[PDB]
Amino acid sequence: LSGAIVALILVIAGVIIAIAVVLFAFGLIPGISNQGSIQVLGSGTITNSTASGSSRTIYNITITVKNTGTT
């Protein structure tokens, strides 16, 4: 008897997990868009910004950035 009862449980669970995985594949798609939100416009500048005789060299990066995203 046991084998048929087990197969029935695993059939129905198979349908449920397969549908959930298909829905997840459709559900990913909106996240892909955000990978393109930024673009950098023109040349930026680097400037030596550290104080005289300081242990660390520290530069200053100025760039135009454009954010086309919603965040």
Ligand X SMILES: *[C@@H]1O[C@H](CO)[C@@H](O[C@@H]2O[C@H](CO[C@H]3O[C@H](CO)[C@@H](O)[C@H](O)[C@@H]3O)[C@@H](O)[C@H](O)[C@H]2NC(C)=O)[C@H](O)[C@H]1NC(C)=O
The binder of 65, among ligand X, its own copies, none, by C-beta within 5 to 8 A per type, is none
52 touches ligand X by CB under 6 A: yes
The nearer residue to its own copies, 25 or 51, going by C-beta atoms, is: 25
The Cα-based distances of 25 to 9, 22, 35 in angstroms read: 25, 5, 17
60 touches its own copies by CB under 8 A: no
61 touches its own copies by CB under 8 A: no
Which positions ≥6 away from 68 have C-beta within 8 Å?
Answer: 36, 37, 38, 39
Q: How far is CA 9 from the centre of its chain?
A: 36
Chain positions contacting its own copies, by CB under 8 A? 1, 5, 8-9, 12, 15-16, 19-37, 39-43
Chain positions contacting ligand X, by CB under 6 A? 47-50, 52-53, 57, 60
